[PDB]
Design a protein around this ligand. Structure first.
Ligand SMILES: OC[C@H]1O[C@@H]2O[C@H]3[C@H](O)[C@@H](O)[C@@H](O[C@H]4[C@H](O)[C@@H](O)[C@@H](O[C@H]5[C@H](O)[C@@H](O)[C@@H](O[C@H]6[C@H](O)[C@@H](O)[C@@H](O[C@H]7[C@H](O)[C@@H](O)[C@@H](O[C@H]8[C@H](O)[C@@H](O)[C@@H](O[C@H]1[C@H](O)[C@H]2O)O[C@@H]8CO)O[C@@H]7CO)O[C@@H]6CO)O[C@@H]5CO)O[C@@H]4CO)O[C@@H]3CO
Ligand SMILES: OC[C@H]1O[C@@H]2O[C@H]3[C@H](O)[C@@H](O)[C@@H](O[C@H]4[C@H](O)[C@@H](O)[C@@H](O[C@H]5[C@H](O)[C@@H](O)[C@@H](O[C@H]6[C@H](O)[C@@H](O)[C@@H](O[C@H]7[C@H](O)[C@@H](O)[C@@H](O[C@H]8[C@H](O)[C@@H](O)[C@@H](O[C@H]1[C@H](O)[C@H]2O)O[C@@H]8CO)O[C@@H]7CO)O[C@@H]6CO)O[C@@H]5CO)O[C@@H]4CO)O[C@@H]3CO
Ligand SMILES: OC[C@H]1O[C@@H]2O[C@H]3[C@H](O)[C@@H](O)[C@@H](O[C@H]4[C@H](O)[C@@H](O)[C@@H](O[C@H]5[C@H](O)[C@@H](O)[C@@H](O[C@H]6[C@H](O)[C@@H](O)[C@@H](O[C@H]7[C@H](O)[C@@H](O)[C@@H](O[C@H]8[C@H](O)[C@@H](O)[C@@H](O[C@H]1[C@H](O)[C@H]2O)O[C@@H]8CO)O[C@@H]7CO)O[C@@H]6CO)O[C@@H]5CO)O[C@@H]4CO)O[C@@H]3CO
Ligand SMILES: [Ca+2]
Ligand SMILES: [Ca+2]
Ligand SMILES: [Cl-]
Ligand SMILES: [Cl-]
Length: 651
């Protein structure tokens, strides 16, 4: 992130037999396989293990307070496969620690990469009995059922956005605990917070970064002054973010309160997906990895400069054995310690395929219903192309979902050309792009094919935290339209997401046409840009009810949720349809649907049309009757107006 006022020393190579940390032969040395990296606290002793093969000396530095002076500095013993060990024979509860190493001529001090608790702003590791952080009844925590990734409805949310608006009616504004408060009310008495979210019928809340991110993003010691950040600046991967706790200065508070949040979501029928950012760290020069083992954990070009394919300054070297181990053990920590139900991998194309498949394999051993989705964008890096976990390699990543950007841009228009129209806004030639997404991105037939082998690999969305909101994109691409016409386009885009095969994904506030005032990239914009505006929600309760009704329609019809590509190819049929419309049927009780056949019309044409319907039986209106002038029994549909219509032939 910043200019480093200092030196990186890559080591005295005599320590490693003349083999440099950059050499390809280095990877086969020092591959520790134990499960005890970090510190293990017991009442009579704490055991430390540090992986630092290039260091000539290593110490545990003990502190009594989070901002105090060292009270003890103990040398560690060189142990197996590049590690250092130390047992401190005292009760270390309540203490803090760092490691100090000598690498080359430099002495460096760093937080434990395997930290499970930290002091304020994450500058020291906190020693802690994590069992003391478990909520009452945590042992009885039970997940809501989930039969298929296609049965999930994901709701993407930032912990600060949720509650920081002054009329949210939530007491612990901006905190994990704000999402545990039930019966909260907003303007005109509307439900807000948790009750609003459960009322929508979504199944998964995907939380923007809840791991500990950098002080430059949010200073945890100055929370009495304005602050906001998405948090894509990782500092401590295995501990929660301090600013979402009621007391950033109490190491246990953030841990207990996140567990209480997850417990409450599960009890209210919601699963939790964690946004994880293993592709980069906040600052490649200052991160603990670089202080402890410089040159290993991050990717370097041949000329020994950082590979910067993330556009964040650095990339994590996920393909090197000890970093692969780190990432896997981190994910398993969040699953085992925090009962997390899924992961969304930021810039997944920066992670190697072997690592991603091992993650998916290890999670399947625990619970196959844990979700794994990610940004599988094709992006350049020093990591060879055939190893990148992106769309081009999706056939090598079974069971991992990827955001379907092809569908996104077909529906609402190019996200990088703000004024360019798409299907909903009357652009020409987007119908096949919408059809490709309807089919869940699979190889459906003809030119209707995308990257997915199976529909569980395709996450459908028209809004997320990145880029303009759907409302703001519609505004920029429809300068000649009225706001009433724009609201109809907005509703159509949401209907396309929720009636397409694959995994539907909604951005928090999409239900009330969330706006950021035209801000394209709001990662550090103030709360007035980023909050969930509960006043707008109160003015848009009909639109909220429409989203709720779309979610209910998808739940009522398993034909929208087919689990396999073979079923989609057997049951989904596209019908002849005029420009600026798409029409399809889901035939023969698809996926166990109660109705014999469904017909779905996506109508982006504002005028009156008479459409031919397939002769499959006595059609009746199930959704979108506000657009239907008549249903003629040679069957025909008389429609007017932009929106979705769903018909059914009953059993
Ligand atoms: O003197 C040789 C020795 O020097 C160095 O060790 C120093 C170390 O670096 C310092 O940190 C400190 O050690 C203190 C330690 O950190 C504290 O934790 C505590 O140690 C207690 C242990 O925590 C506790 O578990 C128990 O220890 C018992 C062992 O668990 C048990 O296995 C057995 O130990 C026997 C060994 O298994 C056996 O191999 C053999 O040990 C020899 C080592 O293999 C050999 O390398 C060398 O050790 C070096 C060491 O590598 C340096 O880092 O010689 C050892 C033989 O003397 O024999 C062991 C049996 O004696 O039994 C032990 C004892 O019950 O209890 C201890 C507390 O007793 O306190 C430590 C200091 O009090 O200082 C040491 C140097 O003083
Ligand atoms: O450069 C830093 C960059 O970081 C952030 O971008 C993130 C972005 O917000 C996320 O959405 C995602 O991006 C991925 C995207 O979602 C995927 O779809 C795919 O992108 C492909 C497009 O789908 C595809 O259409 C095509 O894109 C072409 C454009 O349509 C075309 O317009 C042109 O793009 C030019 C832009 O019009 C022009 O503005 C300029 O772009 C600059 C941006 O203006 C500037 O803000 C910044 O971008 C940020 C971004 O704001 C962050 O949010 O730098 C840009 C410098 O170029 O120039 C463009 C010239 O290329 O051409 C493109 C390419 O032909 O192909 C793309 C590529 O596959 O993958 C995206 C990730 O690569 O993640 C990113 C990264 O975090
Ligand atoms: O409460 C939210 C709602 O409030 C306002 O609507 C009022 C409306 O303006 C008044 O006219 C009156 O409504 C009565 C109506 O006049 C009567 O005709 C009857 O309605 C029956 C229908 O005639 C009958 O066809 C059937 O309706 C079915 C539809 O045909 C079928 O399409 C589907 O309906 C779904 C919608 O298509 C879909 O859009 C979505 O509806 C949501 C709206 O989009 C959203 O704006 C909001 O609606 C507001 C509305 O804008 C206000 O003007 O919430 C809606 C519900 O989520 O989802 C629908 C459900 O799937 O299915 C329906 C039902 O099977 O039956 C109905 C009822 O018997 O009675 C109406 C009174 O109940 O008053 C309403 C407010 O009460
Ligand atoms: Ca932090
Ligand atoms: Ca699977
Ligand atoms: Cl805060
Ligand atoms: Cl690529």
């Amino acid at each position: 992130q910043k200019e480093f006022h200092g030196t990186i020393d890559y080591g005295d190579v005599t320590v490693t037999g003349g083999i440099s940390v950059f050499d390809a032969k280095f990877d086969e040395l020092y591959v520790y396989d134990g499960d005890d990296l970090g510190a293990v606290y017991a009442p009579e002793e704490t055991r430390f293990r540090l992986w630092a093969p290039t260091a000539s000396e290593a110490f545990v530095v003990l502190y009594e307070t989070e901002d105090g002076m060292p009270v003890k500095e103990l040398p560690m013993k060189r142990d197996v496969q590049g590690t250092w060990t130390l047992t401190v024979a005292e009760d270390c509860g309540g203490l803090f620690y760092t490691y100090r190493v000598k690498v080359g001529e430099q002495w460096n001090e760093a937080v434990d990469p395997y930290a499970k608790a930290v002091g304020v702003n994450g500058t020291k590791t906190a020693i802690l009995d994590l069992r003391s952080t478990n909520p009452e009844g945590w042992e009885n925590d039970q997940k809501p059922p989930l039969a298929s990734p296609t049965d999930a409805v994901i709701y993407e949310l930032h912990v600060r956005d949720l509650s920081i608006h002054p009329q949210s009616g939530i007491r612990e504004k901006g905190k994990f605990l704000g999402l545990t408060e039930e019966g909260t009310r907003g303007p005109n008495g509307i439900p807000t917070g948790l009750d609003h979210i459960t009322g929508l019928g979504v199944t998964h809340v995907q939380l923007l970064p809840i791991y500990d991110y950098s002080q430059e993003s949010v200073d945890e010691s100055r929370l009495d002054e304005p602050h906001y950040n998405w948090g894509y600046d990782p500092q401590n991967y295995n501990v929660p973010e301090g600013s979402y706790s009621t007391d950033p200065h109490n190491p246990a508070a953030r841990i207990l309160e996140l567990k209480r949040l997850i417990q409450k979501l599960h009890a209210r029928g919601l699963r939790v997906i964690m946004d994880v950012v293993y592709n980069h760290v906040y600052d490649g020069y200052l991160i603990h990895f670089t202080k402890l083992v410089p040159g290993y954990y991050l990717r370097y070009k041949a000329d020994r400069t950082f590979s910067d394919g993330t556009f964040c300054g650095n990339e994590c070297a996920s393909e090197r054995p000890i970093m692969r181990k780190y990432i896997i053990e981190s994910i398993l920590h969040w699953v085992r310690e925090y009962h997390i139900d899924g992961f969304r991998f930021d810039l997944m194309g920066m992670i190697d395929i072997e690592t991603m498949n091992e993650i998916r394999r290890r999670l399947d051993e625990i619970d196959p219903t844990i979700l794994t989705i990610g940004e599988g964008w094709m992006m350049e890096t020093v990591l060879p192309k055939e190893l990148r976990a992106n769309q081009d390699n999706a056939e090598k990543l079974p069971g991992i979902g990827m955001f379907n950007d092809g569908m996104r841009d077909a529906v609402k228009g190019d996200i990088f050309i703000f004024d360019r129209k798409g299907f909903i806004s009357g652009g020409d030639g987007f119908e096949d792009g919408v059809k490709r997404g309807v089919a869940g991105g699979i190889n459906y037939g003809g030119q209707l094919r995308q990257f997915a082998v199976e529909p569980v690999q395709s996450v459908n969305y028209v809004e997320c935290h990145d880029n303009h909101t759907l409302w703001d994109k519609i505004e920029l691409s429809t300068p000649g339209a009225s706001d009433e016409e724009r609201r109809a386009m907005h509703r159509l885009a949401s209907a396309i997401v929720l009636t397409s095969q694959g995994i539907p994904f909604l951005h928090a506030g999409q239900e009330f046409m969330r706006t950021k005032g035209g801000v394209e990239n709001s990662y550090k914009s103030p709360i007035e840009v980023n909050w969930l505006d509960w006043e707008r929600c109160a003015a848009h309760q009909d639109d909220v009810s429409y989203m709720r009704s779309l979610i209910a329609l998808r739940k009522a019809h398993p034909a929208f949720r087919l689990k396999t590509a073979d079923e989609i190819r057997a049951h989904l049929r596209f019908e002849a349809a005029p420009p600026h419309t798409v029409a399809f049927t889901l035939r023969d009780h698809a996926g166990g649907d109660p109705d014999r056949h469904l017909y779905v019309l996506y109508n982006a044409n504002p005028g009156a049309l008479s459409l031919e319907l397939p002769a499959l039986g006595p059609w009746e209106v199930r959704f979108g009757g506000e657009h239907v002038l008549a249903l003629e029994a040679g069957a025909r549909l008389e429609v007017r107006g932009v929106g979705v219509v769903v018909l059914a032939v009953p059993r």
